[model samples]
Target chain A: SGFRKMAFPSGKVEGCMVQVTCGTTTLNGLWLDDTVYCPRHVICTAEDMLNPNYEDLLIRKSNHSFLVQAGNVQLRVIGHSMQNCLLRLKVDTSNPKTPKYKFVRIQPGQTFSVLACYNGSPSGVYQCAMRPNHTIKGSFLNGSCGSVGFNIDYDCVSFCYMHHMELPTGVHAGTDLEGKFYGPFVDRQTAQAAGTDTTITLNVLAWLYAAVINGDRWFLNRFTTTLNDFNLVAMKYNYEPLTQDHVDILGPLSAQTGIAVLDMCAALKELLQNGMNGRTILGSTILEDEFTPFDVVRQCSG
Target chain B: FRKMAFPSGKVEGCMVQVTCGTTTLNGLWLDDTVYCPRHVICTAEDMLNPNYEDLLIRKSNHSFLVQAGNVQLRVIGHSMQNCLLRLKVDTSNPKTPKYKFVRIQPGQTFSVLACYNGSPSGVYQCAMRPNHTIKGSFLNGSCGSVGFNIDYDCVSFCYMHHMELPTGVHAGTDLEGKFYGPFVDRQTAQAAGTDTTITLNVLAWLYAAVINGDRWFLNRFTTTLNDFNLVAMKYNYEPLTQDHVDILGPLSAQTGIAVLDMCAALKELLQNGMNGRTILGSTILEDEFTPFDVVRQCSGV
Candidate 1:
């Protein structure tokens, strides 16, 4: 057996031994070792080809007025000979019950600026799509197009996403393509929480909370829970310690640390249970009068 | 007139003349001489001012279209400037008449081609006003103004009367200084029918009869009598021929015509006599046989 090593900037690895074929050249047979040294920092090669996480890709921001502010958000797709290109962005409220998504269309080589008013909804998500320039006539897979998704937290001031389309044979093969996505974001927690599942949850919850807070009775009726079901559950369990299921579901999907999930869950639980009587839910405690009053009365203790 | 003999191409004579001094200039006095020859042509004497008529005057045939037919006319003035200024044609109807007269305004300056539609009753008169370059203002009357009335029926058109305003420095000195009169003939007749009056009447009557026969009703009315007042007639029969007086009135004052007065009278008479015939007593004549034709007997012994 020959050994293969995989490395990353960080030095964590696991090893497995496998046999290799020396001279046999069969189309179906395996030639290389099955197992090798896999470093923790080394991402799966297939991961690059996978669709970007909608919650991980976008930059979020808010507009207080009606004028379209330029340089607020820009999507840059860097590639060669990119034909029939189109860019798009969507703004959605975070609420599970209310999925209000507004789409903005953009042309190739063109940047779109959005001047959206908050109108009480706090945050939203943005997504993108790209397809082949030519129509595939009389083909079984005709109209099969590719798309990518990303997230923008309210706190993200600006971010960029670079997309590229390559021809089957070209001098530009294997070249690095670059694109940028940017916008002005608000709320630092929302910005830092981007590229994570919490971004989705935060966006949904913000919109729901706004409806409830503003006493919008009509919103309570018209809104449905179908579009943001996952975000609803995430908000509900935000303060709890992660079960194995939680880690498995939200961990790799959001690229968030397990600890971050636990922290958010604890804070959310405290807010729901005690109406946010205290800020530091898990780490520290203070003998504040408001906390004491709520605790003493609610627990029936002095 | 003082007779003075000349050698050739000249006449030497002392013409009845008047000279004015600075003291004798009266504004209202008729200082103008009836006949004054300012110059006597003599070889021995220097010509102070030559008589223009003696030097340059010539009689010439002036053709005019008086009534759509050719008529020879005469012009006598300064020969160098003498020319027919205008020709007028009149065409007025007599029955159910509306009087009309046409005039070619002075200084129009056109040649007469032909006068084919002639009417004797509808008299055509031509008059001449002096041609002057400088138009007169109030103080200076350097240019002379005169008008001569022509007789349409005469063998030759001649001026019966010449009217002129005061000339030279005395002009505008007084309005009363103006003069007008006819240059009379030498002989006078005893009987009214023997004088020019009968001739004028004959011409007028003949012209009217022709118009009546020719169905020229307008010309008949216009030539025979004035429509407004019958007393005012276009052709006259009077002392020395009222024809001149009647024709002159209309020719000078365009509105004062005898034909218009006669038409007016005829219209009033018809209106009163045949009230059912609509004012002018005009009725359509049918070609059907009359009742008298059926009642007539075969023998008219």
Candidate 2:
């Protein structure tokens, strides 16, 4: 009932502001929270979903949870003909205050009753079910409020745990591929010693292959230590780098070298599929979002 | 299935043979058609699935004209030797003619495969001297040695445009039978308003394919392979000895360099950029059998 006490009576409740934040004492230096919605709500209208004027939200499904990401305020429109459609907010309801005005950090698994309108009538009160952890699927409509539609700025603060991704060099006696970390390089054992779930295994060959094909020659040529280390891993994984004689035969920018580049990538792909068995590889492929060395960290850690 | 030709006694065929269920559908060499079986629940739309069984039929071939709900999917043709066999002994020197069993079938091209200068064995495409001819002499040793002089004029297709003599070899040296690089003269290209950078890239593409091979389709890339060898020999500054004529491997040696097509591919690359994204068309870049990834689409993976 803390959420109900915090709910609007008639007029619209201002939308919740969603943003990505990184700061001190936070993982990746970002104070980040993840929001997930039901798959069924994909067709429904959210503040940023239907409006072209607003910044479009980035929605990705991670094991059946629709992760919601936006740079601006977002509100959900729970409109007419409501049945079993509902959304849940994971919020710590220890203190009573306006939910839309301020972000409240809540303890994990704390539940609250929130009100949403349906079909022009007082619909129903819903509780945050904690069984499935952070899922908001199948909690909305109970066939009550018709023609009594209301706006709910469902806001909740979610916690993020910092994780470390371990990139394999794929060569025996070879050291692990290093990722650009915030401060100190956190290894698997170090993370384990801290008693945090932070180690993820990344297929380094896939990342190398992706880098080559994506035309990150700057990364390849500039990072000689990385390249030489990768060369051993590549040979181990069946991606034989071009011989010195061959490179001498064909100039660096020669089409022959380009062909060599492709051949190596093809081998990289084969090994990635068969050897690595399809694991995390590259960052976002969108043109607008060019990948950085740090992005690799976020992606693999993700 | 339609049949295609290769000079190496091969009736050219597809690399990957197509089949519906258990029944086979061998592709044609002409337009590369692989016929659909007479009775089957085959829908052309089924080819749209990424996991479709027809590996040879790519996404580009998915759309076909439907007649009365029956799909007529176009089969993209790739070349391979239908009956590739090798002649082990020396087929050139009639003086020491090694008796070898030879057979010829209707509509099949016959070529002799041999090696020279410790290089890989390739098909011999040049004609032998009259005295060195092995015609009906497979059983007798009455022909000239394998090192007999070859009349270059008789086979003028060997010379490619902008072909370069090896590093130290001068123009004064008789290039009548010598190795040469396929270099487009900078002056010549500039006169034609073509960038030499583009020319180098095109040469690089052809040379790369020759060195590493075109992978699954060497026959299809015969012309590019031949030109590169000729150019490589030119780079090494070597003379055109008798054995040197067979410098290429069996698949490429079977067919004389199809100068027209190589010229076409090179010219296209030069006219546009190496990447094949000009206002002009991209046939050479998009050629299914060519190993060159001009579009760089593989980089996305």
Candidate 3:
């Protein structure tokens, strides 16, 4: 069975030969990529007479996630070259989600437009439907021919094009595709910030830390134990460690995804406290002086 | 009560009053200024001859005693045995320190003038000479010319009382953004006002005026003025700058610092003086006499 990943180009080989006869002349079909084709170039794929998803074949999922992002697309409708398709599309954002719907009428030569989602909403998986057939019948009588009647049928179905759309990895604020917002970070701040309620950006951070979980396990354990060891506590706390509810998230995970998220939450807090790290990498702000710590302090104090 | 605070115990009546409206201020004949032993010399001879000068009238000091019996009691009957001499001095020298030499003496009066009478108040003042060093220091110093002790004195002996030596006119350097009028002697710093080639009193007045202009310009002045009183007119110059003026003009009163601070530095002139005399920072040399001090000193503007 060949692997379905690009990383394994020379996948486990299942070299096989299949025979078919056409008037005493036979052709051999060989398996290479994901299909069976005629080497002699006569014909193959059986007009989709072949099966899919078993082996040696694949069917692209109706719901695509692998496509990072796309902006536009055009295609001909099954009926007339310029046939119109009244379409409704919906995208899944939050897994436990909200998929608001919108409809658009587009023709074969038209470019499709995707309306914006709420700011900072998750990447969406989209699907559209404009199904069911409809027809119109009428009679046209010409002078000599007495009467002539005709009917036209139209296919009402949609083709969906889904993609990941540019998304942010930091500051979860404002509408999607805005010019700003990025990973600002944490530590004890981690506990409070990278909690279970946090979204993808920090979640992804946890995932990354999960990568080093083998190495991180020790530190994570030491921290949680030490923190839980604290006798009486209320407010909140991170560090490479965690907050209370987050203890539930990282609990048992120095004890490593959830834990990593905790680790990264602390990372987030640290990012904030220490000024987003790497002074050399991200030069100081050119904004007015008020745009800095003093402002932040004033706001936080107030 | 003694007619004069004569040096050397000079009582009333030992001398005569000389008249000299001859030297004029605003063309006002100033004759009554003659109660002292000093004389007026506006003639071409006196102007050119140093022999008649205050510092060099080459006779050894002289003295004679007129006994204590009604000697002073004459112009002085109820005056008693205080046979002091009537010190006749240059009338125009208004601030000569008045003193009483309450002893017997005409000899003492002559001796005092020769040596140290009250002071050589006005010689540095309205000297009619074509030229003389504004002061001895000024004569030997900078500005490369002599301070023809000409005649700028439409006024009299200056200083609030007798705190400063009164021999020279006030002169000043270009210090501190022109706060001191920085008078260039018409001929350029012949001396710091009659004091010497470098006293800053004019500039001091300039400093006072501009600063006092803060008060005066505001029409807020309450007291009578002397050169110590400062006032300002139109800035009259530009970049419209004066560290002192710039600093004082601001309402918020804030400014940046570092480097040489001109406003703060220029203030050296407005402060107290050093040594035994009182003046603005050595604007007038520390211990010398400057004749330019006056009540309404600035030419008023």
Candidate 4:
């Protein structure tokens, strides 16, 4: 149909200042359109440009799909700047929900690609953003492209929405009351809400609930008001809190209190959110190109 | 006094058969006089006329002089026969009241002397009767010399006053207020109470009173009534008379209900003797010689 192109500034740009604008509005104030993938055509045999294999010429598109027919193209990315980059293709057109894709954490010379039979759908798109790595101080946006408005007839090239063949399995599909698998669109609000680390009060309530449900009385003393109070004060003063030094003390206390960590987390979330003044916010959003690691939140929260 | 020599049978004969006609009796029915050695003068010595030891003998005058040491002698004839064979001693001396001596089943032999050193207040007499060992059948006045009016040297022997020992020390002593002591007396009474067989109940009560108070609980099952019931039933009696058995049964049952055995016995004794029918018997008389072995009666009463 028609092709459009936009060039980035040649000089070095602030990773954070770089913005991906759709028409006039910044999609989410994000550095890039992480939901798009660019399509590219490869010249086969150097003279077969006019009759290049149409399947091989089709570039992988978006975080949702992969192009498997373009097996000849050897793609490699370098440096930690590509940590969050994903190559996608609609390997199975019948099930649009789960199109095949591959994830790539290119470290300077790491290479990965979409091969033939790596089918994708027309609507498939890939998205990515720079993730924290040894090379970058913090997470920074690198680049993105999509297949929405592009001419596939010629060897088209654009930094619009490059096919991200590898997309992280979005936050594990949660089942609703009706057992229906659902995922959220990773929007700025959803990401902000989901990204907020949750701090849990490791207090007697947690120990008690766990002890009752799990018969773990040993954890009781761990969450004593005194211990929690000390922890709270230490945290408030930005001091190093005591690590549980008494392993022996833990068992009886836990058993006596009998509380579960997850249940406690859920309760604490509810309490902080709705108890007095609703200081907490909870969400069920599915992140794109990343799997939310609980460990990260846990460490950060503690 | 004239030194009159009467017939050998006349004077000695009168003294032996002369029963004290005193109407007022101050002691128990059994009192007697016997010659006990001041110190065994000579073991198994047989003298034609034994001179009483000076320490044991007392003389009053031409007749004779003798003193009733701690006990007085008297003669009591059994109600059935005027055999005039039994001797009784007055044991109610103020110093020691309670037991008077009586001829126990095993007979003790004695001899009499004439013109012996004695007290005028004391007299010895003999009655002529066929000795039981010599005569197979009953003896009439067969002319054996009965000592008449001569008081000769003689010593007094009396039965032991077992009940006079300290409370809780002697089985016959009233266990009214005394609570603490070795349970020797208790054991003795318990032995006598249960047909000379000490029972756990008795032992338990004794132990409680002396050692551990909790053992008193064991007495609930012991009192006289319960014991009788058990005994009667064991003997295969068809229907025990509730009246007789209740006398001890109610007592035992009440004892069981009481906090302490002593308290229970005291209360029961008070109620029965003062208020109810004096069934078990009166509280021991102040001067009666109750055998220590019979102390269980106090508790039972």
Model 2 alpha-carbon drift over 4 Å, by segment:
A1-302, B1-301
The C-alpha stretches of model 1 lying farther than 4 A from their native spots are A1-302, B1-163, B166-212, B215-301
Error of 3 at B195 (Å): 78
In model 3, the Cα lDDT at residue B195 comes to 17
DockQ of each: 0.00, 0.00, 0.00, 0.00
Residue range A35-77, candidate 1, lDDT tens digits: 1111111111224234332222222211211111111321121
CA-lDDT, candidates in order: 0.19, 0.23, 0.20, 0.22
Kindly list the per-residue Cα lDDT of model 3 for residues A120-214, writing each as its tens digit: 11111111111111110110001101000101111111212111111121111111111111122110111222122211221223322432332
lDDT of 1 by residue, B100-216 (tens): 112322121111100111111001111122121111111111111111111121111111111112221011100112211221111222111111112222223222322223222
- Fnat of candidate 1, please? 0.00
Which numbered prediction scores highest in lDDT against the true structure?
A: 2
Rank list by lDDT: 2, 4, 3, 1
What's each prediction's clash count? 56, 25, 76, 103
TM-score of chain A, model 4? 0.20
Query: Which stretches of model 3 miss by more than 4 angstroms?
Result: A1-201, A214-254, A257-264, A279-302, B1-301
lDDT of 4 by residue, B25-116 (tens): 11112124222111112112422233433312332111111234332244221111111112233332232213222322101111122111
RMSD of each: 55.1, 29.1, 44.8, 54.0
